[PDB]
Symmetry: D2
């Protein structure tokens, strides 16, 4: 009865929305209808030209991207770059579920948006990260979703408990490796297979990366102290995956950092704490909506280290969208989002 | 009802079988229960120490592979080296469904089997290739199953429908590239990551790879003529996937061959014919039970060319295992096996 | 005192030429200066913005590709392995040593050329593959070089000693895996890292690959029969590397065939026969101008199998180019060319 | 004429010394000669069996690792599987140049050594990082040399100059990604291509890594305050390369920090300072002995960021090893070591 359209369907995100939408129970029983699949430039093509893993929808024809095609859908995924979701949302009937993978609606501070993105703040919508305290309540039956960035999802999951229990200091370093699908499907020379194979490199360093404020915005959402974030992302030879290594100055004990995480997550179905003597690997969460997380303390340096492993495309993008979609239409949150990753 | 056991749950196959069983719809509604996860290798530990993606079963403990342990199971998965499924099939009730991922019960010729293994021939169970014509009816209600080798699964899918209608000569050549995951978890020096990264090498050439006669066996089943197969495997920097390039001297028009395949596979839900001038790619099938297949004709060389992409671990082993038992138990055969790959 | 210019310096073939020139003995003593570096687009930027691995040259500003800029150089390299260089070559003084990496001057049949390239045939220079019979002689002193394609160099190297001795039939099959760098540096979607990592796809199949007639061409110079080439190329997750699997039916015994290959190759310094029971791998030759070669007989298939492994940018391109530059300036053939690869 | 021996030649470390030795200019003129090749578990096999990339020495036989096999050599490179070569070192003539790629003779603090390794402190020989203040002198004419770890080489090359001019706090964080050739050649189930490919994982975190102290020790040698090291190593899908992300609270403008680096390094030919707007990548330095460094300041977070790239098997092992052995014998430091990488 609920028909959904996808803007950006030819992208990596839109291909991952459509993969999950195809595995959904409400798509098996026909509750959910895959409607119009639109793209910016390849309007006229079949889906199987872009996404040959989506063979069920291979025949589909990709449509232009305007409200003339997105009307009369109940949900609408925008897997768009920024600046487009803002104008496009305003064009759709305010009763339709807009779920935005773009950044346009993530930020609460307008002057912060302006410094990192260079367009005008559209405004804030419910953040698509159910585990974040106070977010699940906000998304229940909501008709707007701003899905998080991939890196902030890894960083908040790794760091927020220990800072929410005031067991670490509100200055955190984050260094996260990520696979090449976070860069997008836009072809450049830095994303050529020959350039990324057999090479790592960090980029947009020393605070300029746009996720930096997102990490701090979500860290400020469980603390009263000023929050400082040094963010460094590294590109590695992998197609999916994000290993976030999170550090902060601490003084509290391990048994208290530990016990605070399993209280935060012992009921969270998608967040998994590694058994003692295990560390997360991106490999283990790939294709799933899970996050493998380990905590430890560096004593000779008085530092808390949290490590976190998500899939940039699932829990960092599309999974988060469908998860928070489920809460938006009252369906079971884990409707269609497995915790078993495809390995090796 | 229907209790399930897995012998050799330590290795790549066991985990993959467990991964499928966890998504099987009979596991949701209870008609299937995951029981003894047995293993000679490291009996005593938790699964998670070996399969950190199967976290619903990370707590389970690896009992050793014993007749006593598999006893009292309505179904026993056997993903171990050759020779031990001959031993253990003899130690279990002839009514228990035995699905063997090993080699023992595949070759219905006896001098051939001793020829390339040095064993002595255990016997012959129905070939778990529900798309080999006739094989579907020999598994509808069976209790003994031998699932195929990964490369044969791909060659015979690429080659049979054209040899079946004798549009090709029975002298076939097949060079197939595969990931490191079909070589097993037995840590050897040449399977190391540093060596297999950035490297492709041929191995077990000049028809001495024990998948050579298994391709033969499948192929005589569709020709009265004299088959001779030149098989070369090549290993490439990937973990899952098989791309099989299969060519043969031909003289029939492309149209005659094209339509033969559309006939053999139009109502095959797992076998997908690439649209005209599209080509299989392993990344599109990985994590899926799909075979992606394309054919053309080399006129100047008067060769038929067939390309077949399977996920080596799903459709080439575990997914076929699961597929056969679906037919064994009179459950729909598409249950718990998807055609949507995980890509990129 | 030889001045050298490279047209196409911002790409892979050009960059690898420069890399071999910087470690050349003639460059170390002033006998070879590195003149102009040109490319179509991106003039005025620095070479380090394209090849940060070539830090000795990183300061060099890239100039426009005109026959002017290229003038006043004793040797000019045309780094266009996928481009068309015939125009320029006939606008430069004919006293210049011209090394064309592209295909324009490879083929000695205008008809074959128009069919596979859709353009007017521009002629036929000495094939820069010194190892093939009577190839090294036409090169000694030559001021015009046609550099062979990566795939062609491999297949030819593994099959010709045996066609030449009439110890195999002239109907050869060649299936070659290659890293993504042979696809050049043009930013196309299907060459992004996300796409090529974890996948393998055959491309341009059924003899529609412009390298098919080149292998036929080079093979025909060693026999009298026509030669029928079934050539299949596959892309694998690697940046460099070519491992060609070459089959052909025979009734020769192996010891005769190995005899052929030792005779063809005992005094060839860039060509290494694998000891009995060893097979080449691509990682073993990356960086080196070497080729690694094995040969076997599938007897139950009456087939002869050869494996060749070379680097697609060294022996398949810049190494051959430089190896034929040494023969063209009367310098030692191995000057600048290592036989030791950079593994792992 | 210096006869050189290599203990543990069949490992990644050893293979990389012999490769560098073959390109050394004193191995062409004959002042250097490759003597014994000791191999613990494979005496009696052919080196080619272990290092198919080293074909000039494929024929050599691997001998048992014994002091008589080595004696009678002017130089002995020690590269044991887990170092711990103090025992064997003691069995050698004091006349001999001993270059230890292990850890036993690295650390100058015997209690530190005991705590991290759990063993006798055997002492400390000159550290093979000629670029460190006052270390190059300790190296001219030495006959003992302790090769530094791959990780400390990069962390100390990214951090020493800031600390040396007192421009950062002495509390430093290091997150370093690395290829699997830094973890040795010992066949283990988590070092398999199927496990590494597709995955990143941090290991031995939060002070547990035996290179945390090494980084701490080299940093102390340049400032008068005391230093803490948060060190986190991350394994990524690559055979070679380390990308070190280094941070510390900042005391200064960036102009002060860049000056500190251009002064410290401008006369170091293996250290390359990235230009305006560029950042280092591991793929630029592969197989060269260069390190590429860039530095920046994150003003919002009051954090300095250094990024360093080196080939772990070259500048973190065999290159430092041969670069030291050049100074041990008064040869030019740069002999046999290029600053040009094998990209892509
Ligand atoms: C992570 O959030 C996004 C948002 C837009 C995107 O677009 C693409 C693309 O590949 O075209 N990937 C995307 C990811």
């Amino acid at each position: 009865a609920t028909k959904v359209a996808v803007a950006g369907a030819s992208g990596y995100a839109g291909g991952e929305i459509l993969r999950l939408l195809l595995g959904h129970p409400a798509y098996a029983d026909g509750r959910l209808r895959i409607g119009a699949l639109t793209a910016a430039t390849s309007a006229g093509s079949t889906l199987g030209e872009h996404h040959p893993h989506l063979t069920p929808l291979a025949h589909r024809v990709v449509e232009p991207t305007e409200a003339a095609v997105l009307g009369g859908h109940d949900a609408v995924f925008l897997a768009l770059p920024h600046g487009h979701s803002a104008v496009l949302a305003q064009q759709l009937s305010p009763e339709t579920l807009i779920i935005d993978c773009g950044a346009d609606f993530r930020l609460t501070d307008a002057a912060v948006w302006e410094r990192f993105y260079g367009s005008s703040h559209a405004g804030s919508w419910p953040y698509g990260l159910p585990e974040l305290p106070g977010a699940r309540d906000q998304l229940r039956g909501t008709r707007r979703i701003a899905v998080p960035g991939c890196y902030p999802t890894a960083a908040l999951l790794a760091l927020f408990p220990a800072l929410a229990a005031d067991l670490i200091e509100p200055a955190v370093t984050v260094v996260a490796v990520s696979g090449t699908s976070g860069a997008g499907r836009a072809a450049t020379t830095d994303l050529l297979g020959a350039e990324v194979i057999g090479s790592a490199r960090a980029y947009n360093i020393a605070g300029v990366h746009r996720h930096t404020p997102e990490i701090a915005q979500g860290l400020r959402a469980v603390t009263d102290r000023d929050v400082s974030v040094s963010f460094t992302p590294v590109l590695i030879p992998a197609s999916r995956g994000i290993l976030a290594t999170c550090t902060a100055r601490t003084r509290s004990p391990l048994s208290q950092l530990r016990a605070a995480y399993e209280k935060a997550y012992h009921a969270e179905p998608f967040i998994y704490l590694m058994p003692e003597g295990q560390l997360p690997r991106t490999g283990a969460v790939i294709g799933s909506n899970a996050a493998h997380i380990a905590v430890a303390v560096d004593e000779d340096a008085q530092t808390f280290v949290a490590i976190a492993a998500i899939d940039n495309l699932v829990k960092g993008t599309a999974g988060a969208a469908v998860q928070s979609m489920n809460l938006a239409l009252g369906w079971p949150e884990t409707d269609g989002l497995s915790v078993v990753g495809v390995a090796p």
